[PDB]
């Protein structure tokens, strides 16, 4: 949990009366009780990497022990350890001094993969 804050707008389900002693001269209006926390992925390290190392399907958890029915294979991958977003800056003009109106900022992200497989022929 990085930071905490509350939502703006009307509370759809207000705090029960039994749980708060009403005030207060001032205040009197119960603050927004809709709390959400910002996440944070913390440290990314090479020791925590799951990829760039081979996996051998010695035994499968299910009954299908690695048989690619229909001659197809679905490989799902999620990798947030390489989520760095590159910032590009292109100049529209070059004024005598530095002016923000002369540049456009862009967001770009890239993903590089190399899928390697080793299959075994089987007869039925």
């Amino acid at each position, epitope marked *: 949990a990085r930071h905490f804050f509350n939502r703006a707008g009307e509370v759809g389900e207000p705090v029960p009366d039994t749980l708060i002693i009403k005030g207060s001269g001032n205040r009197t209006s119960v603050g927004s009780s809709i709390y959400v926390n910002t996440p944070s992925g913390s440290l990314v390290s090479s020791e925590a990497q799951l990829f760039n190392k081979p996996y051998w399907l010695q035994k499968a958890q299910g009954h299908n022990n690695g048989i690619c029915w229909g001659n197809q294979l679905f490989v799902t991958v999620v990798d947030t350890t390489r989520s760095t977003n590159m910032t590009l800056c292109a100049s529209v003009t070059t004024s005598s001094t530095y002016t923000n*109106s002369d540049y456009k900022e862009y967001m770009r992200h890239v993903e590089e993969y190399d899928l390697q497989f080793i299959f075994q022929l089987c007869s039925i």
Partner: antibody, heavy 120, light 108 residues
Framework: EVQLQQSGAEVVRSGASVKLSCTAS????????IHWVKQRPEKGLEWIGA????????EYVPKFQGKATMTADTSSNTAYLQLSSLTSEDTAVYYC?????????????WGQGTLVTVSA | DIVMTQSQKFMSTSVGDRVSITCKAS??????VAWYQQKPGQSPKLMIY???NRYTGVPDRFTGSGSGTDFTLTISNMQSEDLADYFC?????????FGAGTKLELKR
């Protein structure tokens, strides 16, 4: 190659509406902040409002609120300025200006100018 | 409503001389001031924006200066093509306002 073409001069009787158009300012993904300026031979230049294509945001002047209505067509096009109950004080030349990409202050790209005459 | 007050409506000078046009603000606007040039029968052309930055186009002959509430446009050595109206504009807060007209005439 960055010029703005407008609707053209129009002679209108009092009590009728007129619609002015602009061109080549207001595209998808780009982005511009379009402004309109009124030029009265006595009051000089008067800012009307600021409209942003790709969002359709609208800001006006309390003097012109209820007098000037602003619209933006995201395809092509943009920027339509229409005035309702036209009086003798609306006889002026109206300009469609766009600072490059964004912002207020900058009007480096002006329209050709449209002379509106409200009289009988 | 920030009022833009320009000193003189007309201004005299001669070819080659140095001219300075003043623009006084009714409020502090930092450096959010722009200058425009308008010739008769034409649409205004942007000259200086952000107080002292020349727009793509405008020769080093034109120089802007000032901050807060006093702003000035200076034309170091003149040409015949510089005879036009000059406006100052405030864009610190809405509504945007302009100054009164200023006609530059030659003493030739």
């Amino acid at each position: 190659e960055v010029q703005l073409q407008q609707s053209g001069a129009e002679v209108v009787r009092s009590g009728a509406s007129v619609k002015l158009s602009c061109t080549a300012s207001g595209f998808n993904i780009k982005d511009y902040a379009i402004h309109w300026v009124k030029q009265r031979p006595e009051k000089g230049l008067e800012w009307i409002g600021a409209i942003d294509p790709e969002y359709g945001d609208t800001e006006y002047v309390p003097k012109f609120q209820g007098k000037a209505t602003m619209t933006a067509d995201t395809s092509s096009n943009t920027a339509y300025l229409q005035l309702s109950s036209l009086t003798s004080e609306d006889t002026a030349v109206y300009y469609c200006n766009a600072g490059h990409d964004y912002d207020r202050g900058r009007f480096p790209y002006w329209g050709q100018g449209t002379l509106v005459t409200v009289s009988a | 409503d920030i009022v833009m007050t320009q000193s003189q409506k007309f201004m005299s000078t001669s070819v080659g001389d140095r001219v300075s046009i003043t623009c006084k603000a009714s409020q502090n606007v930092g450096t959010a001031v722009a200058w425009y040039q308008q010739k008769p029968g034409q649409s205004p052309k942007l000259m200086i924006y952000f107080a002292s930055n020349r727009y793509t186009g405008v020769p080093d002959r034109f120089t802007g200066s000032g901050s807060g509430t006093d702003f000035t446009l200076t034309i170091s050595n003149m040409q015949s093509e510089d005879l036009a109206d000059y406006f100052c504009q405030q864009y610190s807060s809405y509504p945007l306002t302009f100054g009164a007209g200023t006609k530059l005439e030659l003493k030739r």
